[PDB]
Amino acid sequence: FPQFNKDLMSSLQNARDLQDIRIKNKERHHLCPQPGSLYLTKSSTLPRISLQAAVGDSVPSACSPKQLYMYGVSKACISVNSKNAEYFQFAIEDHFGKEALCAGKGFRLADGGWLIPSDDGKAGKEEFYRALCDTPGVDPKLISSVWVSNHYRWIVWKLAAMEFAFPKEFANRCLNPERVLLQLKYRYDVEIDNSSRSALKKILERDDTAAKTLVLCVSDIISLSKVDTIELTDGWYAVKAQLDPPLLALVKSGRLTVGQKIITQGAELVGSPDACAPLEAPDSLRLKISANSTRPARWHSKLGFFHDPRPFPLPLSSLFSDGGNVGCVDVIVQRVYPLQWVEKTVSGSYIFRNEREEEKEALRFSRDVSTVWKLRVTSYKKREKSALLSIWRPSSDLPSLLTEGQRYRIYHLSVSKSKNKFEWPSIQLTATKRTQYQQLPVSSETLLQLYQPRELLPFSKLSDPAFQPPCSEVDVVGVVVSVVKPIGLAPLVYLSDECLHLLVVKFGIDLNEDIKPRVLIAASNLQWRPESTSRVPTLFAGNFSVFSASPKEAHFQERVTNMKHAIENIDTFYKEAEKKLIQVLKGDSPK
Amino acid sequence: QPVDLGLLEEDDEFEEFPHVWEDNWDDDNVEDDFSNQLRAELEKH
């Protein structure tokens, strides 16, 4: 740009106010609409070209320090982050060449607007802005300075990347005035005359506050209270998302960097409703994102709303303890546990009973209690972290559905809890209001790869190293040989099989009454932990565990009987010989 | 011929009104469509 401290400084200043009138004049008629050079080609048929196709498989690869000259990439564009783009400022000198460049006249760029350089040979927001007003078909009265400021922000940032990211495909054909203006009118054609609306637009504008499955990008890591949240832009407007601890941690870690794209089914518009407009959005307003509903998208993909609102099933193995709730798991029901009637105490907490413990305390009895049908499940994928889905107030038509050995795809099955006590790989799915169940077929082998049916524990097993029961739990049937109720805690109930092979059961629950000696007991859901070495293995009675003097279950009776037999033919000296054993099975005294 | 920047479906040409997810977040693989990301590149200079 010329250094004519005057004249060139005027030639312009004149061309401007001369223009200021043009724009001003528009204000005198009903400007019939007039689409731009882009909204008209893209709106036409003409085989379009995906960003991906264009590039042709390859992915976003950095410049190359050098070689960037080999394709020629403005060291200037190469200098724009997602927060300075609102500035940048083209160097008309670098884009027009002395001639007309020297003449105040200015530059009539695509569509017809006049891009009129700044005194010091520049081009920016307030500059391109006026140039859109000077454009045909545009009605200055419909677009704020802020408006073009913002829309100017992304357009450069995008083009900036595209040249810097695919220095060969878009080498040096994207960032320049002709485009930033050819496009600024587009967004105007798009948004103003055709009314199309960005996702965050309808969203924030409450004309579709759906806030479902968006493909947003990170435009900045807000530094406020040392790392507040982040700014999410969908190509047209931005918002600060309310993040969850699992996610936020990722920002810190440098896991979630700026410019990256996210997919998110969660989506919640926390803060302020009322229904605003993207730019005039209340500071008291965040777009909640949840780490178990969100994930990184394909470089290309496309910003905004996605196609289907059907939650993507993600491996159960993952999911964060406090990582927001999940929308879809493709589990394979391991076990099913006994329905519990949990009465909600008065001073707090609750009390858990059984189909039976209820009756008792049901007559023994305003109430206030809810049934809880828990079940242990594992992801259809591989590994298997065996979670414990908890359906509350279950629908009667449910029991007949969810059934061990079967593959189901549960929805919005979340709240995801647990973490206390030991370790940390303790998630905890919980059916929710919107939750739903969808049954899916399983390949014999694949199931037999995750699911090991409910067998009957043969005591001799509790003593084999290699023994590792499914879900570290087991079902049993044996002869009670003695119940010990030491003062304090830890009742015991020693059992026995026809072979007088012993085992022990430490109770967590209460002693099911009919459990005295000579009683063939049938147990279901006993918590198993490694017991070889143990002179007499221990099994623990959980809250899921059960004890029946006369089981309703078929195979149990099949056994409780079948054993009640083989023992009889030995009763001529059993329960005694048996006691005589466990009697010394507490020996190894010193001396 | 070069990429007709006009008929090129842009990263921002939103759809007014209408394996595609990626397992674990704590993933630190080393390839494909989630690797880099045009724009994120620019940021990391």
XYZ file of C-alpha atoms in Angstrom:
636
model
C 0.000 0.000 0.000
C 1.314 3.505 -0.881
C 2.847 5.802 1.725
C 1.175 8.960 0.408
C 0.817 10.519 3.888
C -1.973 12.421 2.156
C -4.130 11.874 -0.934
C -4.013 8.092 -0.671
C -5.168 8.927 2.860
C -7.928 10.949 1.237
C -8.705 9.046 -1.959
C -9.971 6.469 0.540
C -11.573 8.617 3.183
C -13.617 9.926 0.262
C -14.462 6.601 -1.316
C -15.715 5.697 2.143
C -18.214 8.422 3.028
C -19.099 8.301 -0.627
C -20.028 4.664 0.205
C -21.448 5.518 3.602
C -24.116 7.192 1.490
C -24.737 4.102 -0.644
C -25.405 2.001 2.466
C -27.384 4.866 3.889
C -29.421 4.999 0.666
C -30.443 1.338 0.873
C -32.422 2.489 3.874
C -34.876 4.011 1.416
C -36.432 0.977 -0.191
C -37.599 -2.570 0.215
C -34.493 -4.318 -1.029
C -35.677 -7.390 -2.872
C -33.402 -10.306 -1.859
C -30.438 -11.358 -3.966
C -28.460 -14.553 -3.201
C -24.685 -14.658 -3.401
C -22.245 -16.528 -5.623
C -22.008 -19.362 -3.153
C -25.510 -19.791 -1.841
C -26.341 -20.155 -5.528
C -23.848 -22.780 -6.595
C -24.268 -24.920 -3.532
C -28.010 -24.403 -3.812
C -27.788 -25.623 -7.382
C -27.409 -29.311 -8.184
C -23.852 -29.738 -9.452
C -22.010 -32.680 -7.982
C -20.660 -31.329 -4.666
C -17.390 -32.457 -3.099
C -16.865 -33.658 0.460
C -14.018 -32.059 2.392
C -12.734 -35.596 2.762
C -13.017 -36.418 -0.954
C -11.330 -33.162 -1.841
C -8.385 -34.035 0.353
C -8.742 -37.636 -0.754
C -8.360 -39.813 2.339
C -5.377 -38.055 3.948
C -5.823 -36.255 7.275
C -4.993 -32.852 8.795
C -1.184 -32.762 8.793
C 0.764 -29.734 10.049
C 2.642 -27.494 7.629
C 6.314 -28.527 7.835
C 8.132 -25.434 9.154
C 9.732 -25.127 5.731
C 8.065 -26.598 2.632
C 5.183 -24.314 3.629
C 6.897 -22.066 1.094
C 6.942 -25.009 -1.311
C 3.161 -24.525 -1.426
C 3.269 -21.009 -0.136
C 1.332 -20.540 3.050
C 1.021 -17.038 4.364
C 3.274 -16.856 7.378
C 0.338 -14.600 8.279
C -2.485 -17.144 8.115
C -0.056 -19.538 9.725
C -0.400 -17.063 12.582
C -4.004 -17.409 13.681
C -5.450 -19.191 16.668
C -9.187 -19.473 17.331
C -9.106 -16.294 19.398
C -7.269 -13.780 17.215
C -9.087 -14.676 14.015
C -11.557 -11.960 14.936
C -8.634 -9.755 13.922
C -5.902 -11.023 11.641
C -6.267 -8.144 9.133
C -5.423 -8.844 5.535
C -2.617 -6.817 3.999
C -4.352 -5.481 0.896
C -0.803 -4.893 -0.321
C -0.148 -8.665 -0.226
C -3.360 -9.300 -2.168
C -3.797 -6.617 -4.825
C -0.531 -5.112 -6.056
C 0.135 -1.416 -6.652
C -2.414 -0.256 -9.213
C -5.904 0.461 -7.896
C -4.003 -0.412 -4.713
C -2.511 3.042 -4.974
C -5.838 4.590 -6.008
C -8.168 5.343 -3.090
C -10.915 3.806 -5.194
C -10.641 0.598 -3.193
C -11.607 -2.915 -4.258
C -14.925 -4.254 -5.474
C -14.839 -7.856 -4.326
C -17.111 -10.785 -5.073
C -20.837 -10.042 -5.104
C -20.280 -6.330 -5.473
C -19.322 -4.975 -2.106
C -16.409 -2.565 -1.992
C -13.642 -3.617 0.337
C -12.126 -0.247 1.270
C -8.667 -0.512 2.941
C -7.878 1.233 6.202
C -5.663 4.307 6.226
C -2.745 1.992 6.965
C -3.580 -0.550 4.256
C -5.580 -3.112 6.217
C -8.793 -5.088 6.059
C -10.640 -6.431 9.081
C -14.020 -6.852 10.753
C -15.426 -3.325 10.827
C -13.861 -3.094 7.402
C -15.350 -6.251 5.826
C -18.525 -5.396 7.717
C -19.145 -2.136 5.867
C -18.237 -4.081 2.735
C -21.142 -6.456 3.252
C -23.474 -3.492 3.718
C -22.093 -2.148 0.460
C -22.989 -5.542 -1.025
C -26.075 -5.974 -3.252
C -29.188 -7.607 -1.839
C -27.934 -7.125 1.682
C -29.905 -4.864 3.992
C -27.483 -3.157 6.356
C -30.404 -2.856 8.763
C -30.313 -6.614 9.381
C -26.776 -7.301 10.545
C -25.013 -5.848 13.550
C -21.329 -5.015 13.613
C -21.057 -7.770 16.209
C -22.701 -10.155 13.783
C -20.140 -9.815 11.023
C -17.430 -9.600 13.716
C -18.285 -13.108 14.911
C -19.030 -14.635 11.540
C -15.801 -13.075 10.454
C -14.115 -14.894 13.356
C -14.815 -18.388 12.230
C -14.552 -17.913 8.438
C -10.898 -16.944 8.724
C -10.159 -19.564 11.385
C -11.621 -22.229 9.092
C -9.801 -21.062 5.955
C -6.761 -20.561 8.147
C -6.765 -24.221 9.124
C -7.679 -25.597 5.691
C -4.573 -24.037 4.137
C -2.368 -24.799 7.099
C -3.864 -28.281 7.526
C -3.894 -29.396 3.899
C -1.172 -27.042 2.522
C -1.414 -28.907 -0.743
C -5.147 -29.219 -1.402
C -6.020 -25.682 -0.377
C -2.384 -24.487 -0.391
C -3.082 -20.778 -0.841
C -6.590 -20.533 -2.261
C -8.684 -20.102 0.863
C -7.625 -17.215 3.062
C -8.085 -13.880 1.307
C -10.667 -11.092 0.996
C -12.503 -12.449 -2.024
C -13.536 -15.471 0.057
C -14.071 -13.955 3.470
C -16.511 -11.712 1.607
C -17.814 -14.256 -0.861
C -18.673 -16.228 2.226
C -19.711 -13.526 4.638
C -22.581 -12.903 2.241
C -23.316 -16.654 2.214
C -23.848 -16.844 5.948
C -26.038 -13.813 5.271
C -27.911 -15.520 2.431
C -28.122 -18.667 4.572
C -29.111 -17.187 7.883
C -30.938 -13.994 6.998
C -32.898 -14.494 3.778
C -33.344 -18.247 3.963
C -33.652 -18.451 7.706
C -31.549 -21.637 8.075
C -30.267 -21.673 11.686
C -27.128 -22.968 13.326
C -27.568 -25.733 15.885
C -26.567 -23.538 18.794
C -28.937 -21.078 17.173
C -32.185 -23.055 17.375
C -30.761 -24.456 20.610
C -29.978 -21.156 22.399
C -32.924 -19.558 20.631
C -35.236 -22.094 22.256
C -36.884 -22.881 18.907
C -35.443 -26.381 19.318
C -33.710 -26.286 22.708
C -33.615 -30.028 22.143
C -29.914 -30.022 22.885
C -29.485 -33.595 21.664
C -26.704 -34.904 19.408
C -24.382 -32.052 18.414
C -20.984 -32.038 16.722
C -19.364 -28.973 18.195
C -15.723 -27.918 18.251
C -13.519 -26.426 20.966
C -12.692 -22.774 20.341
C -11.059 -21.837 23.641
C -10.174 -23.070 27.110
C -11.804 -20.443 29.357
C -9.431 -19.323 32.073
C -11.417 -17.866 34.958
C -12.041 -19.139 38.566
C -7.077 -22.078 36.920
C -9.228 -23.712 34.240
C -12.932 -22.904 34.194
C -14.505 -24.665 31.226
C -14.252 -24.334 27.490
C -15.884 -22.531 24.591
C -17.763 -24.676 22.114
C -18.487 -23.286 18.649
C -20.568 -24.986 15.987
C -19.178 -22.956 13.132
C -21.693 -20.201 13.611
C -21.888 -19.299 17.295
C -20.154 -20.276 20.536
C -21.010 -21.256 24.125
C -19.189 -22.077 27.335
C -20.009 -25.647 28.240
C -20.615 -26.826 31.794
C -18.165 -29.697 32.159
C -18.065 -32.743 34.386
C -14.996 -33.830 36.389
C -14.111 -36.711 34.090
C -14.040 -34.312 31.143
C -12.526 -31.253 32.730
C -9.642 -33.455 33.848
C -9.095 -34.184 30.138
C -8.762 -30.477 29.382
C -6.141 -30.196 32.126
C -4.321 -33.328 30.937
C -4.176 -31.691 27.541
C -6.497 -34.438 26.403
C -9.038 -32.011 24.975
C -7.138 -29.388 22.957
C -8.633 -26.488 21.043
C -9.832 -26.990 17.509
C -10.878 -30.552 18.297
C -14.368 -31.804 17.530
C -16.745 -33.531 19.912
C -19.938 -35.576 19.451
C -22.450 -35.345 22.270
C -25.817 -36.869 22.954
C -26.028 -35.592 26.516
C -26.461 -31.861 25.917
C -28.156 -29.686 28.532
C -28.761 -25.941 28.457
C -27.950 -25.068 32.055
C -28.093 -21.514 33.308
C -30.687 -19.358 31.575
C -33.787 -20.209 29.456
C -36.228 -17.463 28.461
C -35.076 -17.828 24.835
C -32.418 -15.426 23.614
C -30.288 -15.118 20.463
C -26.713 -16.555 20.168
C -24.937 -13.230 20.497
C -27.133 -11.696 23.168
C -26.790 -14.879 25.221
C -26.922 -14.369 29.032
C -23.539 -14.771 30.685
C -25.412 -16.848 33.247
C -25.702 -19.650 30.683
C -23.756 -22.863 29.988
C -24.233 -25.835 27.652
C -23.715 -28.889 29.877
C -21.603 -31.634 28.368
C -21.248 -35.100 29.935
C -18.150 -37.294 29.568
C -20.243 -40.433 29.099
C -22.344 -38.965 26.352
C -19.481 -37.287 24.581
C -16.507 -38.290 22.449
C -14.072 -36.969 19.762
C -15.418 -36.851 16.168
C -13.897 -37.567 12.754
C -11.733 -34.648 11.629
C -14.235 -34.026 8.882
C -17.662 -35.135 10.008
C -19.513 -31.803 10.061
C -20.456 -29.308 12.742
C -23.934 -29.007 14.164
C -26.754 -31.482 14.631
C -25.992 -35.065 13.614
C -28.383 -37.526 12.010
C -29.874 -39.912 14.582
C -30.681 -39.172 18.253
C -30.305 -42.894 18.992
C -27.538 -43.046 21.672
C -24.327 -44.573 20.452
C -23.550 -47.692 22.445
C -20.163 -47.328 24.065
C -18.152 -49.967 26.023
C -19.327 -50.283 29.611
C -15.722 -50.869 30.646
C -15.219 -47.130 30.356
C -17.795 -44.649 31.616
C -16.628 -42.544 34.526
C -17.523 -42.971 38.154
C -18.733 -39.371 38.274
C -18.786 -39.018 34.510
C -22.398 -38.102 33.879
C -24.931 -40.729 32.910
C -24.775 -43.071 29.856
C -27.341 -43.361 27.135
C -26.629 -46.768 25.639
C -24.929 -50.040 26.654
C -24.887 -53.291 24.690
C -24.648 -55.623 27.685
C -25.197 -59.375 28.092
C -27.066 -60.069 31.375
C -24.843 -62.237 33.618
C -26.979 -62.987 36.629
C -30.310 -61.884 37.932
C -30.733 -61.221 41.638
C -33.737 -61.564 44.015
C -36.158 -58.628 44.058
C -35.751 -56.472 47.171
C -38.320 -54.222 48.882
C -36.265 -51.330 50.237
C -38.283 -49.322 52.767
C -37.081 -45.747 53.147
C -36.313 -45.036 56.803
C -37.514 -41.855 58.506
C -34.310 -40.314 59.900
C -32.640 -41.243 56.629
C -31.206 -44.205 54.724
C -33.291 -47.274 53.954
C -33.849 -50.902 54.946
C -33.664 -53.875 52.586
C -36.008 -56.887 52.842
C -36.948 -59.881 50.664
C -40.161 -61.057 49.098
C -40.517 -62.687 52.488
C -38.874 -60.197 54.875
C -41.640 -57.914 53.625
C -44.637 -60.103 54.536
C -43.237 -60.477 58.055
C -42.687 -56.739 58.555
C -45.800 -56.347 56.388
C -48.125 -57.654 59.077
C -45.664 -56.850 61.842
C -46.754 -53.379 60.771
C -47.305 -44.717 56.093
C -45.060 -47.524 54.883
C -43.086 -46.013 51.987
C -40.931 -48.523 50.149
C -39.785 -49.304 46.614
C -38.879 -52.629 45.041
C -35.425 -52.904 43.493
C -34.559 -55.505 40.886
C -30.775 -55.545 40.483
C -28.888 -57.635 37.921
C -25.213 -58.129 37.062
C -24.356 -57.386 33.417
C -21.367 -57.148 31.139
C -20.557 -55.404 27.859
C -21.050 -57.509 24.719
C -17.661 -56.303 23.442
C -14.866 -58.089 25.317
C -12.919 -57.598 28.579
C -16.085 -57.312 30.684
C -16.243 -55.165 33.798
C -19.475 -56.831 34.883
C -21.601 -53.940 36.095
C -24.645 -54.081 38.339
C -27.695 -52.476 36.665
C -30.344 -51.459 39.240
C -33.920 -51.169 37.963
C -36.148 -49.482 40.531
C -39.929 -49.798 40.806
C -39.609 -52.384 37.949
C -42.575 -52.949 35.668
C -44.186 -56.385 35.989
C -43.623 -56.950 32.260
C -39.925 -56.711 32.981
C -39.083 -59.999 34.819
C -40.453 -61.991 31.917
C -38.099 -59.999 29.711
C -34.594 -59.440 31.090
C -33.249 -62.969 31.512
C -29.700 -64.223 32.131
C -27.835 -65.529 29.096
C -29.616 -62.961 26.957
C -28.191 -59.983 25.076
C -29.876 -56.657 25.653
C -29.180 -53.071 24.714
C -30.341 -50.860 27.595
C -30.914 -47.112 27.187
C -30.396 -44.064 29.347
C -29.478 -46.736 31.818
C -27.388 -44.469 33.971
C -26.634 -42.280 36.969
C -23.436 -44.290 37.192
C -22.259 -44.385 40.799
C -20.113 -46.399 43.216
C -16.445 -45.763 44.040
C -16.090 -46.098 47.831
C -14.468 -48.889 49.845
C -11.667 -50.330 47.695
C -10.091 -49.818 44.275
C -12.077 -47.786 41.753
C -13.374 -49.884 38.819
C -16.792 -49.818 40.474
C -19.328 -48.194 38.151
C -23.038 -48.672 38.790
C -25.744 -48.363 36.162
C -29.316 -47.546 37.360
C -32.372 -47.681 35.085
C -33.888 -44.218 34.581
C -37.244 -42.701 33.693
C -36.501 -42.664 29.956
C -34.541 -45.915 30.086
C -35.561 -48.691 27.725
C -34.606 -52.261 26.920
C -33.915 -53.674 23.449
C -33.172 -57.392 23.037
C -30.450 -58.499 20.598
C -29.349 -61.974 19.317
C -26.063 -63.569 20.368
C -23.688 -65.934 18.565
C -23.534 -69.163 20.560
C -19.752 -68.943 20.994
C -19.711 -65.215 21.744
C -22.170 -65.755 24.596
C -20.350 -68.875 25.773
C -17.461 -66.427 25.729
C -18.998 -64.087 28.304
C -21.806 -66.100 29.908
C -21.281 -69.139 32.140
C -24.695 -70.511 33.262
C -25.668 -71.074 36.841
C -24.175 -74.396 37.961
C -24.135 -75.969 41.436
C -20.918 -75.650 43.446
C -19.343 -79.007 44.258
C -17.472 -78.320 47.523
C -14.369 -80.232 46.358
C -14.046 -77.187 44.071
C -13.627 -74.578 46.775
C -10.319 -76.303 47.282
C -8.848 -76.282 43.805
C -6.424 -73.521 42.935
C -7.577 -73.116 39.342
C -11.200 -72.794 40.512
C -12.653 -69.452 39.501
C -16.447 -69.241 39.604
C -18.491 -66.945 37.299
C -18.980 -63.545 38.896
C -17.061 -64.770 41.938
C -20.451 -66.041 43.137
C -21.927 -69.528 43.617
C -25.098 -71.486 44.487
C -25.026 -74.389 46.944
C -26.846 -77.199 48.727
C -25.558 -78.845 51.891
C -26.166 -80.165 55.393
C -25.925 -77.564 58.158
C -23.609 -79.025 60.769
C -23.511 -76.166 63.269
C -24.462 -72.508 63.508
C -22.293 -70.140 65.525
C -23.530 -66.681 66.511
C -20.552 -65.104 68.340
C -21.410 -61.916 70.183
C -20.748 -58.797 68.152
C -20.967 -59.884 64.521
C -20.205 -62.708 62.042
C -22.775 -65.480 62.412
C -21.617 -68.741 60.924
C -23.292 -71.719 59.332
C -20.988 -74.674 58.568
C -22.285 -76.958 55.867
C -21.415 -80.399 54.566
C -21.853 -82.698 51.602
C -22.302 -86.446 51.651
C -18.527 -86.761 51.595
C -18.259 -84.799 54.830
C -16.249 -82.269 52.842
C -16.675 -79.031 54.779
C -17.148 -75.361 53.876
C -18.268 -72.262 55.826
C -20.588 -69.324 55.276
C -20.144 -65.951 57.014
C -23.451 -64.125 57.003
C -23.911 -60.509 56.114
C -27.679 -60.752 56.326
C -29.820 -62.188 59.129
C -30.133 -65.928 59.818
C -33.151 -67.088 57.775
C -34.771 -68.755 60.831
C -35.143 -72.364 59.615
C -31.398 -72.976 59.372
C -30.636 -75.134 62.400
C -28.562 -78.337 62.096
C -29.793 -81.361 60.141
C -31.489 -78.896 57.777
C -30.545 -79.435 54.147
C -29.920 -75.869 53.102
C -30.032 -74.558 49.580
C -28.122 -71.351 48.900
C -28.175 -69.038 45.902
C -25.829 -66.137 45.257
C -23.024 -66.793 47.698
C -20.045 -64.442 47.417
C -16.937 -66.453 46.620
C -13.310 -65.538 47.322
C -10.202 -67.829 46.965
C -10.265 -70.509 49.633
C -7.797 -73.308 48.926
C -5.283 -73.677 51.756
C -8.301 -73.080 54.007
C -8.872 -76.114 56.266
C -12.458 -75.265 55.478
C -13.249 -72.675 52.727
C -15.435 -69.681 53.443
C -18.343 -68.359 51.467
C -19.974 -65.028 52.348
C -23.698 -64.337 52.537
C -24.337 -61.123 50.686
C -27.569 -59.165 50.448
C -28.194 -60.959 47.193
C -27.570 -64.315 48.856
C -30.503 -66.565 49.727
C -31.344 -69.483 52.020
C -34.337 -71.843 51.717
C -35.172 -74.853 53.894
C -37.108 -76.196 50.909
C -36.155 -74.390 47.665
C -38.824 -73.774 45.023
C -36.096 -74.058 42.391
C -36.201 -77.401 40.542
C -32.569 -78.501 40.179
C -32.098 -77.638 43.829
C -34.749 -80.048 45.024
C -33.272 -82.450 42.496
C -30.195 -82.160 44.662
C -31.471 -81.401 48.142
C -33.271 -84.686 47.704
C -30.579 -86.616 45.825
C -28.230 -85.733 48.679
C -30.723 -86.119 51.519
C -30.501 -89.645 50.185
C -26.832 -90.674 49.898
C -26.466 -89.249 53.392
C -29.221 -91.404 54.926
C -27.412 -94.548 53.823
C -24.678 -93.213 56.120
C -26.811 -91.564 58.805
C -26.137 -94.696 60.878
C -23.217 -92.521 61.951
C -23.330 -89.193 60.125
C -24.295 -85.895 61.758
C -22.186 -87.202 64.629
C -19.193 -88.401 62.606
C -19.653 -85.093 60.807
C -19.583 -83.042 64.003
C -16.690 -85.156 65.267
C -14.827 -83.907 62.181
C -15.469 -80.178 62.174
C -14.875 -80.601 65.900
C -11.176 -81.177 65.241
C -11.312 -79.182 62.028
C -10.481 -76.351 64.403
C -7.207 -77.844 65.481
C -3.533 -77.185 64.873
C -2.989 -76.194 68.483
C 0.436 -75.172 69.731
C 2.696 -77.755 71.444
C -8.158 -29.489 -12.069
C -8.191 -28.211 -8.475
C -10.742 -28.443 -5.645
C -13.646 -26.346 -6.893
C -13.813 -24.433 -3.606
C -17.386 -23.584 -4.510
C -18.837 -27.062 -4.836
C -16.769 -28.236 -1.900
C -19.009 -29.363 0.972
C -17.608 -27.305 3.824
C -16.970 -28.251 7.419
C -19.577 -25.633 8.346
C -22.403 -26.008 5.789
C -24.776 -27.205 8.523
C -27.904 -29.304 7.867
C -30.922 -27.282 9.023
C -32.861 -30.390 9.903
C -31.799 -33.949 9.052
C -17.115 -46.522 14.239
C -18.993 -43.176 14.464
C -18.360 -42.843 18.210
C -15.030 -44.316 19.393
C -14.912 -46.549 22.510
C -12.986 -45.317 25.536
C -12.172 -41.659 26.061
C -9.040 -42.470 28.045
C -7.793 -43.761 24.704
C -4.273 -42.981 23.554
C -4.155 -44.839 20.235
C -2.089 -43.429 17.361
C -4.093 -43.121 14.124
C -6.944 -42.305 11.701
C -9.919 -39.915 11.586
C -9.601 -38.908 15.241
C -5.817 -38.555 15.203
C -5.131 -34.930 14.355
C -8.025 -32.695 13.214
C -7.912 -29.699 10.863
C -8.064 -26.628 13.063
C -6.759 -28.318 16.168
C -3.586 -28.627 14.092
C -3.359 -24.886 13.489
C -3.711 -24.315 17.232
C -0.822 -26.640 18.026
C 1.044 -24.644 15.398
